[PDB]
């Protein structure tokens, strides 16, 4: 059964231009820019246009939807073919993905360390040696099976590091020390093993198929949107741009039912909030990562 489709009651522009922003709690300067408002409004507009087609039966599978997200995102790249390739390619199971917790991701270090669910662990390094890391281990549950996801790690004997890093540099070379920190920074996110992504992807068509019901209440819809957001963002299916695509898709399904979600709150980067939480936590906290204030 067909669906309403995007609303005609649109968010005020000031809010369009914040759809898919990355409103870092430590630099919402980039949220305010002319280009980033331009980027966001475009995402706003292409979400609804995907919105239009979910309503009509056009987009049959979450993978098709994710394509639309990817097509959109690529047309915003003014970068070139190494970078184009990345935003357009799924992560393959023969690689790992890693985000070092340098700028602009510094706000995250604190989020891991004061996180109730964090462990204290020992991380054994070939260059620095042994390290105390606060470790958050995101895990989903699916069919009743446990799927590790992203693993945050923050190194905590900081003094020893700055000393040891400076030490290590001059021998191997920054060249050879950079090498190491691109992949093995004491502070880093290690993302979902690309191997889990087939079953996650199957799971997402399942959710997608469910959420393009007609019979669902407002509550159970938003739940299913938060989830789809939650899984897609946390799987990080692509080499780059996953956060942008997750939000786009989560929103396109909303608009297909005639919902108009607002921007996310400031300091609430959607894919990080998702990554740093479990599923039901995020589903319930969802409506308030959103700027729902008149």
């Amino acid at each position: 059964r067909a669906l309403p489709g995007p609303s005609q009651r649109q968010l005020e522009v000031y809010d369009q231009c914040l759809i898919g922003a990355a409103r870092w709690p430590d630099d919402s300067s980039k949220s305010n820019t002319p280009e980033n408002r331009a980027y966001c409004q475009s995402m706003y507009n292409s979400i609804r246009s995907a919105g239009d087609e979910i309503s009509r039966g056009g987009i049959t599978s979450f993978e098709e939807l994710w394509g639309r997200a990817t097509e959109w995102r690529l047309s915003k790249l003014q970068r070139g073919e190494p970078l184009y390739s990345a935003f357009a390619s799924e992560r393959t199971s023969d690689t790992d993905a890693v985000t070092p917790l340098v700028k602009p991701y510094k706000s995250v270090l604190a989020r891991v360390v004061d996180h109730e669910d964090a462990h204290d662990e020992i991380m054994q390094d070939n260059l620095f040696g042994d390290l105390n890391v606060k470790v958050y281990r995101q895990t989903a549950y699916l069919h009743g099976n446990v799927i590790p996801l992203n693993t945050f790690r923050v190194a905590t004997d900081t003094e020893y590091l700055r000393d040891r890093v400076a030490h290590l540099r001059t021998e191997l070379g920054a060249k050879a020390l950079k090498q190491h920190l691109q992949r093995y920074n004491p502070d880093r996110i290690d993302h979902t093993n690309a191997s889990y992504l087939p079953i996650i992807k199957d799971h997402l068509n399942d959710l997608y198929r469910q959420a393009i019901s007609s019979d669902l209440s407002q509550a159970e819809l938003i739940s299913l949107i938060a989830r789809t957001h939650w899984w897609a963002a946390s799987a990080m299916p692509d080499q780059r741009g996953s956060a942008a695509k997750a939000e786009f898709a989560a929103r396109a399904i909303a608009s297909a039912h005639g919902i108009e979600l607002p921007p996310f709150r400031n300091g609430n980067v959607s894919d990080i909030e998702a990554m740093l939480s479990g599923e039901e936590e995020f589903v319930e906290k969802y409506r308030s990562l959103l700027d729902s204030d008149c």
């Binding site: 992560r91 890093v165 400076a166 992949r183």
Partner: peptide, 25 residues
Amino acid sequence: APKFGDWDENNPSSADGYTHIFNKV
């Protein structure tokens, strides 16, 4: 002791802050 992470000050070898992909070992 330094802020978390701030042991990585002015290091020319500071990683870049975006997702990198590597071959599995």
